[PDB]
Design a protein around this nucleic acid. Sequence first.
RNA 1: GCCCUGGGCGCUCAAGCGUGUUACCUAUACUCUACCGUCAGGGUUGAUAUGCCCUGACGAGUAGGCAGG
RNA 2: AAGCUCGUUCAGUUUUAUGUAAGAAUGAAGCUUUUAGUGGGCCAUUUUUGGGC
RNA 3: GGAAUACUGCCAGCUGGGACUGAGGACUGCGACGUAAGUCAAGGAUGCUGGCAAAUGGUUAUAUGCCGCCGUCUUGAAACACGGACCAAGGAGUCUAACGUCUAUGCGAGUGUUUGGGUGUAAAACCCAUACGCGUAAUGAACGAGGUUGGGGCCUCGAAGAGGUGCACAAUCGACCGAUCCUGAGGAUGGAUUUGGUAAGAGCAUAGCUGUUGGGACCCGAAAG
RNA 4: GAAAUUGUUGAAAGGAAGGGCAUUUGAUCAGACAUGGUGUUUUGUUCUCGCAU
Lengths: 33, 125, 140, 222
Amino acid sequence: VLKKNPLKNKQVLLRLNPYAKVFAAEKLGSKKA
Amino acid sequence: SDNVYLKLLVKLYTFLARRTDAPFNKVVLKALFLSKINRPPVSVSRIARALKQEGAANKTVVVVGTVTDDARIFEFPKTTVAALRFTAGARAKIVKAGGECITLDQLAVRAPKGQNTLILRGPRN
Amino acid sequence: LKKTRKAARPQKLRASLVPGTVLILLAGRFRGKRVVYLKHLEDNTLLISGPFKVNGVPLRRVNARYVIATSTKVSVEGVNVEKFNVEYFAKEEIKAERVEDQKVVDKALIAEIKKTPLLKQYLSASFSLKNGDKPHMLKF
Amino acid sequence: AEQVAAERAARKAANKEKRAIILERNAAYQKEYETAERNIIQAKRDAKAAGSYYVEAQHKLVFVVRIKGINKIPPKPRKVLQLLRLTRINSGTFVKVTKATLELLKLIEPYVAYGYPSYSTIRQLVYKRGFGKINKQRVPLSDNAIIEANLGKYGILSIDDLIHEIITVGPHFKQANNFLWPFKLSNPSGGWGVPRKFKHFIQGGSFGNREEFINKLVKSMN
RNA sequence: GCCCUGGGCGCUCAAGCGUGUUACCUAUACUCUACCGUCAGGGUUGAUAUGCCCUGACGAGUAGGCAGG
RNA sequence: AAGCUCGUUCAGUUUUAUGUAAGAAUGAAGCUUUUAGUGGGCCAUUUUUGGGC
RNA sequence: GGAAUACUGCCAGCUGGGACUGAGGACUGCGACGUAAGUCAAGGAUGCUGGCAAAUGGUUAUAUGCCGCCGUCUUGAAACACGGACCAAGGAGUCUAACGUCUAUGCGAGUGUUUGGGUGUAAAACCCAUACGCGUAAUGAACGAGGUUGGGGCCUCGAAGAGGUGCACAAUCGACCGAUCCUGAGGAUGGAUUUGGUAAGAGCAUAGCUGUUGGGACCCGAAAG
RNA sequence: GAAAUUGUUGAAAGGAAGGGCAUUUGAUCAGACAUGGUGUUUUGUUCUCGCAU
């Protein structure tokens, strides 16, 4: 009934792509070479 | 249409179409909406000639149109026919041959999935 | 009514509000007066004291959004504010307890106020704007 | 009856297994992307060090956005846009890069802007404005089951799988692009920048191939 | 390159001219959401019906045609 | 609008064949039959005519 | 030799300020937290507080910010072109004859009671014998009242699919006959050049919109015998 | 016993106004018709079984 927006509302963001938890828990967005 | 009985039959066939999967219900439901011109008479001769089809010895014929008696045929094998309207002459001929004439509701209660059912249309050209 | 999923999360106060901080009220009978913050109440109001003996402002409940924070802070560890509660303001003329409790609270803070020079008179003076003032630039 | 708990437990176990499968698939995709980018950078480094020029691969994926209104559009570009699902203004879709499509963009270039997207922009679009087409209806992508049911036979069972298929232009690119409803995009947050939008990008305009700048434009228009 | 002969107020290191760089003004255009309707899909009766509903899209317009009051 | 019956068949869409067997891309049917109205010029453009038109 | 920094792109990084929105209506669904109970920002707002016997707001007048005479006319969207002093009533695709399409009802190879007769609670209501409006065996209608290929559907086997089956007709060729071109036991009789249907009817009556000519014919008016 | 039209009284403003978007001022009005909703003892054909409450 309501379109949850990903990126925002981290709870819904975890519903899709379970790897987001690992990505946030390992700082992969700023991984050093 | 405005016939209450026709409306009840349409309701029943619509219920069967979406709950029985078999296309037989859908075809009959679609044919029900056909106008009078689109539902020409089906003579008993047309039923008799088609009843010799291979594997149709014990099959049941359904005629959405109107069954009309014919004077070009005499011998009628024992069979079962279902149609919206049956003429007095055709009804007597079918009953005399040991067959049975039934309404669409009886056919739906005896063949929910269209088993042993045969649909015959009438000429239009 | 559907089961609305909205928990009553506890209020989060801005870092600029700390117990013993000097508060300024912008609305009410005491608007423009300087007050001292004491304790945060369960009703999301701020328990404050004038103190009453200095500027006449008694212990009152106030809303944070109507209060301008200031860097000046005073000690408030010796004041036992645990006695006050939301039920202490219900009414369903001044009550007898309202005087003795106010005096007791102010007794444990007048000495601290006098410790800092010019703080007593500073609180006794009502804050007000002046021509050419620019609140956005001013740090308050 | 005992069904209330048994069915719940069975479906929860199945969902947990599917979640682990999707997690491993997403981890593999992320590792593949990182390895590919590292290998490309290493190849560029080797080319630079060896005193030889680099041979970058051709851009296999492009994105086109409608920039002009319907009014006064000549019939040929209008038909091209209609067959490209670029009906309403500020709408776009992913298209495979081929001479059959490059020559199509050549005709609609005056009224459209396009370039080469990136993983971040594609993921953001799919997560925010990603809408799927099911039974001819427009269904937002909010659950992995919704995508899996429509593309399970093709090996797609999650939003990450759809993003991976779209970016890599894999064998099921046709189906992945068709399932995605045309993207509804707002006007850029910071504006088009150039005072005159209806000009070629290479001369201070807007429409035309801009390559990496399309990623920046989309994010502002997202 | 510009000048001379050949909207009103005013403007002159322009508030004139060409160009480069940022910000801002706002259409019924675009993006999110509230409501009416049409169009499309689906649930529906071991009774919950020409009904009670879920989902999406669409909304300019003379003559003319159809439908509903 | 009016019947059938195929769900696929189609395109003012884009290059190699020499205009196509296209298992190239992209988007997303047909025959009927009778039934109201429909007999304009023009802005720009095209073919690029000569001496103003 | 060394970092740093400008720039580009990423953060499924963090932390705020401000604007609109509260839409659904007892739980069923996908997820996170947790060893379990249970909790959650997880298929749409909740909790607390204050002012009120005119409360909020509606119509209207007047002033402020911005915007701005009618139907028919040529038809290039047009200026030009008729009508308008105001008001109450009247006013115009209405009725009918013959031919239809479309939709419904009854019957059905039949259909149609009402020119009339019987009868009647009396222009009301209920029945019918003659024939009679239309088709029904015709362009004597069977080689078989059609196989060859398809075909809404039916089932045998197996989910996908395979087999047969065949409803109207999609295409073709043949069968009968009015008919085409020889033949001459008068045109017999046997073929056959092509021909316009039958195949195993599909129609009559009523009701409703609607098509076109004729009657005044959407309404007022036109130099006269 | 209606409209054009006109007479007494009350509101109005300065070669013109009735018309459209949002607001104040002056007048005026439905103004919520809340009559609602929660559990007992007192006295008569022990008593809330139920009436005035």
